[PDB]
Ligand binder design. Sequence first.
Ligand code: CLA
Ligand code: CLA
Ligand code: CLA
Ligand code: CLA
Ligand code: CLA
Ligand SMILES: CCCCCCCCCCCCCCCC(=O)OC[C@H](COP(=O)(O)OC[C@@H](O)CO)OC(=O)CCCCCCCCCCCCCCC
Ligand SMILES: CC1=C(/C=C/C(C)=C/C=C/C(C)=C/C=C/C=C(C)/C=C/C=C(C)/C=C/C2=C(C)CCCC2(C)C)C(C)(C)CCC1
Ligand SMILES: CC1=C(/C=C/C(C)=C/C=C/C(C)=C/C=C/C=C(C)/C=C/C=C(C)/C=C/C2=C(C)CCCC2(C)C)C(C)(C)CCC1
Ligand SMILES: CCCCCCCS[C@@H]1O[C@H](CO)[C@@H](O)[C@H](O)[C@H]1O
Ligand code: OEX
Ligand SMILES: [Ca+2]
Ligand SMILES: [Cl-]
Ligand SMILES: [Cl-]
Ligand SMILES: [Fe+2]
Ligand SMILES: [Mg+2]
Lengths: 38, 342, 81, 30, 33, 38, 114, 64, 34, 57, 34, 504, 36
Amino acid sequence: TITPSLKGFFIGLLSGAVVLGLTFAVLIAISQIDKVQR
Amino acid sequence: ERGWFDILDDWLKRDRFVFVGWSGILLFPCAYLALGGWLTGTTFVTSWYTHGLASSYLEGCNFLTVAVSTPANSMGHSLLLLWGPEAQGDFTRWCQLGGLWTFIALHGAFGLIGFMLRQFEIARLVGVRPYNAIAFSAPIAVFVSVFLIYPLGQSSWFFAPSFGVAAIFRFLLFFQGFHNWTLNPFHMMGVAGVLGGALLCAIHGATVENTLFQDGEGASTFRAFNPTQAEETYSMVTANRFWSQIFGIAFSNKRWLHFFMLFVPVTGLWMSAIGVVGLALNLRSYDFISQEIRAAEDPEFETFYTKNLLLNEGIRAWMAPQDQPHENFVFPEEVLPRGNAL
Amino acid sequence: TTGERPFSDIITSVRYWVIHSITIPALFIAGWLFVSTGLAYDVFGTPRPDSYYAQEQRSIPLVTDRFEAKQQVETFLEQLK
Amino acid sequence: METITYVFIFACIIALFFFAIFFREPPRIT
Amino acid sequence: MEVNQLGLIATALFVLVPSVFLIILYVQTESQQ
Amino acid sequence: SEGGRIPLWIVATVAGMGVIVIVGLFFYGAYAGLGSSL
Amino acid sequence: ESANYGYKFGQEEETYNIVAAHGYFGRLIFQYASFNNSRSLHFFLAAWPVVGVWFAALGISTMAFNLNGFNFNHSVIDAKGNVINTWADIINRANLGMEVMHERNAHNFPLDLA
Amino acid sequence: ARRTWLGDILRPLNSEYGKVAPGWGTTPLMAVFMGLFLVFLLIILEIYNSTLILDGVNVSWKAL
Amino acid sequence: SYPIFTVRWVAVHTLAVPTIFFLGAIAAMQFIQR
Amino acid sequence: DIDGIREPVSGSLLYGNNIITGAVVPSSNAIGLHFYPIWEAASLDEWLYNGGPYQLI
Amino acid sequence: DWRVLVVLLPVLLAAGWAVRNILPYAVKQVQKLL
Amino acid sequence: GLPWYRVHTVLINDPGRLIAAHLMHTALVAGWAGSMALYELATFDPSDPVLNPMWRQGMFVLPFMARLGVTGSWSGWSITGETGIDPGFWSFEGVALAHIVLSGLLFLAACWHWVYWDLELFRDPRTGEPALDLPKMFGIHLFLAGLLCFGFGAFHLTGLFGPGMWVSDPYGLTGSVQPVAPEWGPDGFNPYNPGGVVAHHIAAGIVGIIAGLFHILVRPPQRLYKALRMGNIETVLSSSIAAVFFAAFVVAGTMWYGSATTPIELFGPTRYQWDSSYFQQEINRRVQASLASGATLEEAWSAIPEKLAFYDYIGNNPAKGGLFRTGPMNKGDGIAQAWKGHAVFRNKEGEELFVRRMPAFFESFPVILTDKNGVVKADIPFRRAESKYSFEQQGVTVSFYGGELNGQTFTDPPTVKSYARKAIFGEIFEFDTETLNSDGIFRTSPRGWFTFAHAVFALLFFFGHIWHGARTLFRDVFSGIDPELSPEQVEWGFYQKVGDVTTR
Amino acid sequence: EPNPNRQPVELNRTSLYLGLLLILVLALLFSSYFFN
Ligand code: CLA
Ligand code: CLA
Ligand code: CLA
Ligand code: CLA
Ligand code: CLA
Ligand SMILES: CCCCCCCCCCCCCCCC(=O)OC[C@H](COP(=O)(O)OC[C@@H](O)CO)OC(=O)CCCCCCCCCCCCCCC
Ligand SMILES: CC1=C(/C=C/C(C)=C/C=C/C(C)=C/C=C/C=C(C)/C=C/C=C(C)/C=C/C2=C(C)CCCC2(C)C)C(C)(C)CCC1
Ligand SMILES: CC1=C(/C=C/C(C)=C/C=C/C(C)=C/C=C/C=C(C)/C=C/C=C(C)/C=C/C2=C(C)CCCC2(C)C)C(C)(C)CCC1
Ligand SMILES: CCCCCCCS[C@@H]1O[C@H](CO)[C@@H](O)[C@H](O)[C@H]1O
Ligand code: OEX
Ligand SMILES: [Ca+2]
Ligand SMILES: [Cl-]
Ligand SMILES: [Cl-]
Ligand SMILES: [Fe+2]
Ligand SMILES: [Mg+2]
């Protein structure tokens, strides 16, 4: 059964995924825009 | 093969005012959150419900007495996640239950990991040996042993140090009264490492500054140095003779000197860490059994060791009820240990 | 040098001060209000000076259960009349 | 026995001071 | 004083085993050309 | 606009004085209201 | 071999690259928090612990004349006048334990004035 | 060097020193398993910690 | 010539902005009476 | 007798101390800041009871 | 809660004002990097 | 020459002698296990598993043998109290012997591999240089470990072909070695469900076999190979050390908090059982049950097993020892002989009073007696002159129920006070302090020592990981940095990307 | 055949002094606790 804490677990999980995901999405976007010259 | 990973790598390792790196992804948010958490907590958050203490500027505490205090003893070693079963996603309750303490301690732990990873990363990019990172292992050992392992061995986070000036002072006094921590040879080694390190810092700096070659005309000697110059800026030979004649022995090897400066405080901190890991289990250096047998049988036998135990007993009895409110210690006046008059 | 504008360059420019002579006092005033409106108290659950104790009580509202802690605090807060 | 031990270790340290100072590796300039 | 009697041997070995180690290493260093 | 117009020593002085004011305010606060023991 | 053999006593040239150490440490923090000047660096290394310990010594020396540490005992009071304890007050409890037990037979009068 | 019967038998098992798969190879897959493992560890940790509380899972000596 | 919005800009403001906000808050606290 | 209350504290190894507990014990509280060289004592035994070695050292 | 808009309004007028002043240079920087 | 702290580096490119060194280490460790077991067997008293179990006697390896099903001596006794048992070969002695013999065999093998270091097997077929294909080696070893793990779980622990493991009731009264079925549901991840241990080894075993096959068949990606320096055996040292301190922290924690694999009958109670009065509550529950069934007080308490009572005593709390208080717990409070029975304190008004139990934090603790509501009703005063709650004023008596003092009541203040002093430690026992010349000061249990040793080693091995990882990743600069390190590579802005000369 | 990996080991006199000082001071420190 989905206990309240299991729900809380999934919420923490999804929160983390969203944080990391947004961070890397932004990082990759910026990295693509502002490239290094060689 | 210039895929997104390599492009991202390029961007992360740009030479900017503040170097980021891969490690920065871990380091900056966690360091920022630990710092921000402590500032937030010490400015606005109480310890009323966990300790029976005011602990914030908002309540009238000053810089010395504010703290982010540990959670209630009843929380055990709960991670105290905001979305956890105790706070249930309620930010306000979470603050009142001591959630900021685990917040700061955990983001702090990972922040330290991030900083050491940063030392490795920059070392690797610039081409130096990673001894700075290695040296930083000692603060990490101290933090991990004192803020994580020690309370994990005890009943709860409550007995971890609280993040505040006076709160830490209390931690010190507690360790004297309950653990007789000054008697611990691991702590003693730590003290030697730290005082010996401070000593080396001073004596090395002073020696260099007073064996300078005159490489300029000005009375300010700082100007007579160029970072790219090949020559040593002070005389190792004169330094060596001076100290050989003053103190008997001297360094003659610069590399060994600077390695030794790394070694002493690092090793000291590691030793103290081991001792605290012992205190996690109350595996103390509390007594000398021979002393106690002699003293138990012989009421005229007195040493500074027995004197200090009397002090510890005082500390325990007088501080325990307010310091451990969850225990509900009621100690009537008549049971309090006191010498004459006082 | 790493490419960014030198700080001495920026903080002595008129434009910097045009911007920040506004943005800085505004933040200061926002923090000030955050306390003066009492909002900080409610956000962080910090007692006001009249909310540490009930009028006759001298006992600490100490949390003593892990999973009922939230309910305990809510109860303590109720008991403040 | 403990006393003998303590004092012995101490005495060895003082002896060591003597040798470390007077019978050190000479620093040699190169 | 009722000390632990093993203390003696514990201390002796504590001093002697590593000291001896060092001495061996040092002497065979000196005997190298 | 162009960087360099307002002399850095004036900036330093004004900044410093601001710091003195705010810290002065905090020390005043040690003797009044909350935390003053009165 | 030990890296230490790479330095020879009295050699004229420096045994490490202060420019590399600076590049590293400067990037660790930011460039302007790092010492490029060995003289000013070593001066800092002298000054910090010496000044600090001077203050420690002055602490003992002025507490010798009973100008003591900050006292915030019962500094925080609620609306009614209840004492709200802070960590300073817990420190005070520990201090009281020490005070009442020390030299347990030496005091006949209620105040320990020296 | 010296050959032995056992050595000749095992020879193939120690013959591909330095052999690699081009590029990233199975790294994405690896990353997936590491993510799964991290969640698994998170779960057993929070169960042991009573941060994650499951029906019928009583983290106590009174389990049996 | 110079860019305005950089990693340094961001780093500076994530620290600077809350700092001023907090200083206002603490300043206000100096006038709280019990 | 460090605190001058005729309650002698043992500091030396021969009198039941180890390296950690041992001490040269401060001169007696009855002496206060008085100068107590050996020749101010009626005997070495007195000087030792009252903690003279501390002052000399 | 009126106190939330009361506290946020100074910061919002601040951000809005700095945007007012810096927008042409910011668009110049975004155009330049693109 | 080599500095003393590098002498073992001569093995890095010598697989044969590396193997010899590993063999020698293994021989030493097996030899230690054998010797340790023999010493314990020479000192162990099997005569009372109730009040003198192994964890009171400083036994460290005996519980690890017992845990996996070795419970008997060739001399006829077992650790559960049976006599006239035939344990077969795999007695304690048999295990110790087997470890000694293994030690000798490994020693011999070590000599052989030391002398015959130059085996063709250790040479790369193409280059003729010493080379170990670490990726494939890892696959092979991981496959073996998976096999072993699986077999341990599926055959040994289940009792399918093997003895099973130590299991017990929640209060550690009736422990024995039993076959254990795997728990395949979520409770399998409950640290107190042994079924979970079984299931874990079966599942993790299979996974290990699959992963082993994978690492045997699939080469490392070039990018991971370079990144991790997989051609360098020291990278394996770094990551192995990491895995090992990971494991060490885990076993320290489960030893300290308790789990299915750290039973209290083998290692002693946990500190948390004292913290939460775990045993006291069960005792009270049983006594209340008896009273509810019309039994008398004396009957209720006499029905409490001594083993249970003995758990409810702080001298068995592993958080009561000291770092240099050496030896078995018996050396401290003594060899427990008998439960004295439950002390019930009453005052002159006949109220039952309860002694405040000593928290583990305190080396010493005042004696304070409260009523059921927690109001202080009596104590042992420090200053007598303004005492209000002295036993003498309050007329405190103590009556014992159960144990050796069952039915007795003492009323003289000194005796009552003696018992109250003991009562702060929980249930009261008679001890033999003469036999071992016990000094009366608490020592920790094997649970304590195990936990300490392993937390400390875990922490030190962290440093090992850092050191060797650094060595792996910075091998090129181990003896120092490039003499020709261009100042512009380390100065700012020269390259756009730090340490990348192609970005000037 | 002779193993090509054998290296000479060294301990200079200063290292002997340092090491001896370490061991003796450690003994001086721990001995009290060993005697207890
Ligand atoms: C960027 C680095 C970083 C790291 C390492 C951490 C680490 C932590 N944070 Mg912090 N945090 C961060 C940034 C970071 N934080 C930022 C930027 C913010 C502002 C948003 C926060 C705000 C924050 C709060 C408010 C809290 C934390 C907390 C924590 C702790 C628990 C986290 C957790 O359980 O996540 C679990 C989630 C993961 C580990 C994500 C893993 C993703 C996997 C690998 C992919 C699979 C996901 C899958 C697709 C999802 C399926 C969902 C489906 C089943 C429905 C942990 C110490 C908690 C705490 O400290 O309590 C004491 C807490 O309350 N953080
Ligand atoms: C399919 C059924 C199944 C079942 C029922 C189990 C059951 C179990 N697994 Mg297994 N497992 C399985 C399949 C299964 N497993 C598979 C297929 C794999 C992949 C090979 C694993 C891999 C695995 C690992 C790696 C571990 C388990 C563990 C366990 C035990 C968890 C309970 C416990 O005591 O955790 C206690 C341990 C934890 C809760 C993990 C702690 C994680 C720490 C906190 C990470 C941080 C460490 C950090 C560096 C320490 C320093 C910080 C500190 C000093 C403050 C339990 C017996 C754990 C165990 O053996 O416990 C004894 C464990 O570590 N399993
Ligand atoms: C040859 C077979 C063999 C058998 C049947 C035994 C049996 C025993 N040994 Mg002995 N031992 C052996 C060989 C053996 N040993 C060897 C070769 C050595 C030298 C290393 C030893 C050294 C030794 C010591 C020092 C001790 C024993 C002890 C014991 C007893 C307890 C065992 C125990 O608790 O393990 C516990 C073992 C583990 C928990 C191993 C876990 C390994 C980790 C978790 C693996 C993680 C890495 C892995 C590769 C991950 C991938 C997994 C994959 C599936 C995903 C038991 C009678 C104990 C004893 O009672 O002595 C009298 C004891 O103290 N043994
Ligand atoms: C995991 C390791 C481990 C653990 C947890 C145990 C646990 C136990 N042992 Mg066993 N034992 C072990 C390994 C272990 N042993 C080994 C390897 C041996 C062979 C030497 C023994 C031989 C042995 C004997 C002969 C006996 C025991 C006994 C015991 C029991 C009492 C322990 C005690 O009093 O310790 C006391 C612990 C200390 C005094 C702590 C010492 C701390 C050291 C000195 C620190 C050193 C500092 C260092 C030099 C600093 C360096 C600084 C520098 C790097 C800069 C306890 C159950 C006793 C028992 O009860 O048997 C029934 C007993 O008689 N053990
Ligand atoms: C799997 C474990 C393991 C292995 C195989 C190695 C292997 C190595 N280490 Mg590493 N190391 C480890 C763990 C390990 N280490 C740990 C846990 C730490 C942190 C303490 C270190 C910290 C470390 C440093 C700082 C250095 C090494 C170095 C080395 C290399 C040379 C070692 C030598 O000649 O010592 C010779 C040692 C002696 C002659 C005497 C040492 C006596 C010790 C200090 C006390 C006695 C211990 C006792 C005998 C056994 C207790 C066992 C314990 C686990 C219970 C060698 C490759 C060196 C290196 O990298 O060279 C290039 C080096 O400088 N190691
Ligand atoms: C002038 C202020 C003096 C403050 C106390 C002394 C500081 C300097 C002495 C340290 C001794 C170290 C051992 C010898 C180290 C040694 O050899 O010094 C050498 C170093 C360089 O010597 P020079 O010969 O180049 O210069 C000294 C003279 O010759 C004048 O040119 O001397 C200085 O830098 C003096 C700096 C004076 C100005 C210092 C100001 C510091 C005050 C900062 C505020 C601190 C307040 C803290 C409050 C919490
Ligand atoms: C917690 C948390 C969080 C976070 C937050 C943050 C991040 C914050 C930040 C904050 C901050 C960041 C703040 C700051 C502050 C600052 C201050 C308050 C300062 C002060 C200062 C002063 C007062 C000064 C002084 C001085 C000195 C020190 C020396 C010199 C002199 C002088 C006097 C100047 C989140 C949301 C994520 C989630 C939830 C939880
Ligand atoms: C040859 C042979 C044989 C025999 C064998 C034998 C007889 C063996 C033995 C063996 C042995 C008998 C071994 C032992 C070992 C031991 C060890 C290896 C130990 C070690 C220890 C240690 C290392 C410790 C350390 C420490 C200390 C001291 C203090 C505290 C801390 C510590 C714990 C660290 C046979 C017939 C079978 C068959 C084949 C041939
Ligand atoms: C005057 C004493 C009358 C009561 C007996 C004391 C409480 S009980 C007593 O406690 C001792 C530990 O101190 C044990 O060694 C002994 O076995 C036990 O009889
Ligand atoms: O002498 Mn040493 O200590 Ca200075 O207070 Mn008073 O006196 Mn005694 O009392 Mn507290
Ligand atoms: Ca008022
Ligand atoms: Cl005193
Ligand atoms: Cl007086
Ligand atoms: Fe230097
Ligand atoms: Mg105020």
